[PDB]
């Protein structure tokens, strides 16, 4: 029984991913987000262990939802006649990283470092669980403003992680790597690193570096804000034009710019309260 169990509040957002609403779980008042996707729009499907045929996104979310992490967890789901309904966690209070950067401008490096580290941890988690997100971007990161914790949202463009080439992509073009732009081909991890490159520049400069395909394939990174040499170096490495010249996640997390990261609590205290 879906409507007896959740109390539906206001629409939080809508778009390519469908329509997401605020909610409270009637039993114990847990805040939730309720996401509706129309069956006619899911072109990628999987099978649960439980026989039943679900949208890939449900598969992906159950793979990454066990235990704690920086991924918004799937708490429950339902099939309706023309849609699927996904019950997700909702942090309170929350703001997404896109609105946060619009409001605050380029972030101080200490803050960019804490945020970026937490995203790295969350993306490593997805890969450990066999899941490739494929739409890493500020708009897909929620900030718990009290705990200082970042959470990944929206696996609807995701895929099972593989080591062979991907030749399909429905994520965000301005975060897509140049081998996708020119050849309609990419490998998972290395495309993931490129999009993290775009995300890191976004954070330290106040907006993404590239809007057009020619800029993406140009691989010229101009800095519009004062950014430290070490940080510019990490960004440029993540945005290397050849995939194999990009850093591994290990290499990113061992980069000198990534040393002495703040704890989430510290980050909330210094930068968010």
């Amino acid at each position: 029984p879906l409507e007896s169990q959740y109390q539906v509040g206001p629409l939080l957002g809508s778009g390519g991913f469908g329509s997401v609403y605020s909610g409270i779980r009637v039993s114990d008042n847990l805040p939730v987000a309720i996401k509706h996707v129309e069956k006619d729009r899911i072109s990628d499907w999987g099978e649960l262990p439980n026989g039943t045929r679900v949208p890939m996104e449900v598969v992906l979310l159950k793979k990454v939802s066990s235990g704690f992490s920086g991924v918004i967890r799937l708490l429950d789901w339902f099939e309706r006649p023309d849609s699927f309904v996904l019950i997700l966690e909702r942090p309170e209070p929350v703001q997404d990283l896109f609105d946060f950067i619009t409001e605050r401008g380029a972030l101080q490096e200490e803050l960019a470092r804490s945020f970026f580290w937490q995203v790295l941890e969350a993306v490593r988690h997805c890969h450990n669980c066999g899941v490739l997100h494929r739409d890493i971007k500020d708009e897909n990161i929620l900030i718990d403003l009290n705990r200082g914790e970042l959470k990944l949202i929206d696996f609807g463009s995701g895929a099972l992680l593989k080591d062979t080439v991907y030749t399909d992509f429905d994520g965000t073009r301005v975060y897509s790597p140049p081998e996708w732009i020119r050849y309609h081909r990419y490998h998972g991890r290395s495309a993931a690193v490129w999009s993290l490159g775009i995300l890191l520049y976004d954070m330290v400069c106040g907006d993404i570096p590239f809007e057009h395909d020619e800029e993406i394939i140009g691989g010229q990174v101009f800095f519009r804000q004062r950014v430290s040499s070490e940080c510019q170096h990490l960004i440029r490495w993540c945005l290397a034009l050849r995939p194999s010249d990009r850093p591994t996640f290990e290499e990113i997390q061992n980069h000198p710019w990534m040393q002495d990261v703040l704890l989430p609590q510290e980050t909330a205290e210094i930068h968010l309260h």
Partner: peptide, 7 residues
């Protein structure tokens, strides 16, 4: 000039 970009 700053904006969201859909999937």
């Amino acid at each position: 000039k700053r904006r969201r970009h859909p999937s």
